Amino acid sequence: SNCVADYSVLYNSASFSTFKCYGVSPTKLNDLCFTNVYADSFVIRGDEV
C-alpha cells in the first residue's frame, strides 16, 4: 500500500510458470488501481498449481 501501482514490472516478468487470473482483466492493469493488497507469499509443491 501507500505507493503508485507500478503494475508494469508486476506483469512483464518472463520468469513466470503459468499466468492465471481470477478476478481481473490483464489489459487495464495500469489503468485500474486498487486500495490495499494483502499478499500470501508461500512455496508450494510442483503438482499443486
Next chain:
Amino acid sequence: RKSNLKPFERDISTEIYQAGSTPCNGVEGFNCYFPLQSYGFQPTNGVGYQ
C-alpha cells in the same frame, strides 16, 4: 482481442494472441495464447449455463 471491435462485423481470424514479447509466428510457445476457446456443452452443468 487485438482489434477494436466495430458493431456488426464478422471476424474469422484464428491468429495467435501474443502475451508479452514472445514471437509465436505460426506456432505456439511461451504463453502463445490461442484465443479460439471452446464451449462447455453438457447436461452436467446447471440450468443457466446451457
